[PDB]
Design a protein around this nucleic acid. Sequence first.
RNA 1: GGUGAAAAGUACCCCGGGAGGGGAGUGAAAGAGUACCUGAAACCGUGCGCUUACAAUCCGUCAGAGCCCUCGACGUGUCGUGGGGUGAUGGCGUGCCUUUUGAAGAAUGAGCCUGCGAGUCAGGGACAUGUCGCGAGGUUAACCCGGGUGGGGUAGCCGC
RNA 2: AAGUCCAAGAGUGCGGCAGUGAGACGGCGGGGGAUAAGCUCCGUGCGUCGAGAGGGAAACAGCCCAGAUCGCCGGCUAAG
RNA 3: GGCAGCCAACGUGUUGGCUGGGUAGGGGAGCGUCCUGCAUCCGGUGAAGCCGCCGAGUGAUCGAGUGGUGGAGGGUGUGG
Lengths: 146, 114, 100, 156, 124, 47, 54
Amino acid sequence: PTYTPKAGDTTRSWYVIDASDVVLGRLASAAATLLRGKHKPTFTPNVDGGDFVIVINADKIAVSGDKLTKKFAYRHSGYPGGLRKRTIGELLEKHPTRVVENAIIGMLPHNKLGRQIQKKLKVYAGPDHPHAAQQPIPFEIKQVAQ
Amino acid sequence: EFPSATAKARYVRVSATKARRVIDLVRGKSVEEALDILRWAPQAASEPVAKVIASAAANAQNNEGLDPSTLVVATVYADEGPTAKRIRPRAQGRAFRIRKRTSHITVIVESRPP
Amino acid sequence: TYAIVKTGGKQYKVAAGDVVKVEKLDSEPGASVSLPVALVVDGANVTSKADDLAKVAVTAEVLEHTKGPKIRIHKFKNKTGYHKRQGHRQQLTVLKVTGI
Amino acid sequence: RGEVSGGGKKPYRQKGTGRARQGSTRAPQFTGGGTVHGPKPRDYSQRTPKKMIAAALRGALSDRARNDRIHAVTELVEGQTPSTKSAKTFLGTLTENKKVLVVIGRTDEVGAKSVRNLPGVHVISPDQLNTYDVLNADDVVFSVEALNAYISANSK
Amino acid sequence: ARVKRALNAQKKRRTVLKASKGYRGQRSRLYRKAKEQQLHSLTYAYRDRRARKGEFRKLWISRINAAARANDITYNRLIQGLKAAGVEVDRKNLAELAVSDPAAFTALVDVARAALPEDVNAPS
Amino acid sequence: VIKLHDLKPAPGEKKAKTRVGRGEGSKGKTAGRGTKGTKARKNVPVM
Amino acid sequence: AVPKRRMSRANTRSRRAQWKAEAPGLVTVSVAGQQRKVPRRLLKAARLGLVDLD
RNA sequence: GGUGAAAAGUACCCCGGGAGGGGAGUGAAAGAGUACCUGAAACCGUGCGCUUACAAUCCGUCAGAGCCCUCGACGUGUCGUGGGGUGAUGGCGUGCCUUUUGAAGAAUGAGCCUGCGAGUCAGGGACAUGUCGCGAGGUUAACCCGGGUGGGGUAGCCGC
RNA sequence: AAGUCCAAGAGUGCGGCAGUGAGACGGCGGGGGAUAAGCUCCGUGCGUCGAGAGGGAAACAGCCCAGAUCGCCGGCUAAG
RNA sequence: GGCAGCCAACGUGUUGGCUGGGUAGGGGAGCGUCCUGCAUCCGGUGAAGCCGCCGAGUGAUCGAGUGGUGGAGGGUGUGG
């Protein structure tokens, strides 16, 4: 039978990704790939076999076009007329980590395992992060050419 | 297995659910503590339960020759018994069914070490 | 050393003494079957060329012929009255690989 | 549902009661109601052609004669007083099989009574000789008169 | 000949309830409601027996692609190269190698890259 | 010898009655009558 | 209104578990030499001999 | 409707006001206690194992960690051609019947279980096919004789 | 004239038994309508659903691919 | 790799080629029930029934395989 990850088989590493000047979609796609564990040959979709990702410089993320002012993050409170909307620029100004984190959880699966995966996304807006004690590995987003 | 005594009060005129409501207060407790709780429990279904438990303890002391102080209500449960069907007349001459429910209360007390 | 044997239309990674259930074979229990290989790996060397693989054959003893799990098909279409009950027990051969 | 007692009246209104439409408390679905397609007295006898009946009997007798299962006898016991012990002894000396069809004449009441009480021994008259009897019996014991009567009635 | 519908009737009921042992609520207790879930149960069993092959192939492809990226090659170019090299190892066993013996998978990656065309994008 | 337990009908002499209305496997539900209509509950006369 | 559907046994059980009796808190009292257990509210009555301790 | 073969239907102990029970006895059996053969399901408990209080579930199915038991092995506790319980998690997934162009349908019926509940029967009926018998013939109806199926019955019927 | 021809499981005739005789949508040709309708009425060796699962159209009988005899934890592809 | 329907070949049933979605419906072959002719076999050394266990069949279903309760009738073959 195909290999199934047993109890003591999921080893998680720590990757730190610098968000400065990186496209939001690229950063979020690669972060979601790492968080899911699509980069591990032991991948199993029913297991959280992914790696912790620490996004830094989340405030200096790069977007394109007018998305910084014409793309809205919406939230409904449930109360009638309770639709708040905040452009990506406003969201970067107020909660810089928000934009990037919302993108990454968007690209993650929407289920119990997805929300257990989210816990490994430690996004930070400053150039510094607190997890230096993890020896996070720098991770550049590279494309495997053909 | 600790020595044990049984006692089955059968066809008690109390709904099995109401007998259970008072059984849960005592299951697993010492016999003395169970009897005190049943004595001070408002639920009228407590008197049949207390009598079953006291009968179990009495059977333990006499028929089994066990020390009463070492007895605890090991397994006590109330099962449904035969239901009598009565008729309650209602408005527009419609007859509803009343259920006079009974219960079989079984108590099994064990002589556990101090 | 392990070989990815081809037997019964499927491929199985085996090593000396590994037991695999495969499709049925026309060999009595206790008989030996030589099965072609899709790839052998000896520790570090990997024989991938079909030319060098056609000369290596995995020998396996037939321990027995078994019947797989009982599949219970009940084809059903609603608002149709179409039920079709059916069963299956795939005939399989259990092989113990003697060596490569 | 028309033969079971009562059930003439429509049990309740057609509409308004919230219950299924019933036209009788004796309808088939009702407990205590009438059987829909239950049995009625039947005459299962079948008008089988005379030649078919006779050929079946001749075939059964032929099978017995081929297997040497047909015996003949001048008398069953001796005459006058029936004797089951004597008849059983004689049928034992004849045939060891269990089922025996004694084709005996109507007038041999002695032999009829004597052999009557043996367990596996049917007694039939030559004119009533039938397939079922011959086939059921392992052997067929004819009184000489019975055999002659059967042969005469058939060759005629 | 009045026949009671009891000996015969209970056989399928016991069968369906035995099969439904494990279902939640009525679907495990009532024969009628168990039968409704058993129809769907075997419809799903058939569907998922036939889709299990595809979903395991999907898992194998995911793992082979993971190992291919680790070995710095794309999955589709890896498959192209394996086909050109004549390596007839299926995706099941390729993923098995990816997980257990990454050196063997790196060997096969080298084989596939070697057998790839000098230019993959050239019309050829 | 031939016996009552050896007697059998001729090959193809007897045919199994068709039990109509017994489950969907055989002629089930409508019992070979199709959906609604006159012929679903009565036989239309020949004339 | 009327219940539109039979309540699942899980929901029935979960709501029915809430119909339970609270165990009375029993305090020791000395009456006639032997020790008895009575609610702290009836503690004064037991001391004054006003409680029928069977 | 059904205790048991027989009432042998619990002389006398204990808890309880009683009911009822526990002893002890009868009995082959009390897993037969006048609530009584067998004792199904629905339904209601209790005990144990797993599982669940961040979760959106036609309640399953397919993969499936973990945990709990079982059969072997080796005789280290780990592996197996294993088996069973539970099911974290992931994929897929729109009840049954009827009736419809089309229903998961917010169309109908069904609260649940058990039991019952629907193409049957008569007729030398009609047609068509199967199969036997006899065959240019084939059958006999009523009826008569047979404690039975069996033997007669040439009137008629269909062939011609 | 060939092809298909260990089959289309063809055509025709005569018999036993039917069910159907409420169709839907899509393409094309048209009528009625406003050259509206998911409208209505026709034609179409046109298709599909009806009575068709599987993949794709997100979900989505009728659209595209493709017609499920069963089992594989094999492979190549269709639409996408 | 298994099964089934048609067909062919030769045999004295093997192979091969095709074909096996399906509602109304048609045809074929079967499972199970209890009642019986006959024949056999099981049963107070424990029948049926019911509850399981271990399994079995291409289906309905099956266990003259087994354990618990049970207490008296059952199974099989072949026909009606």
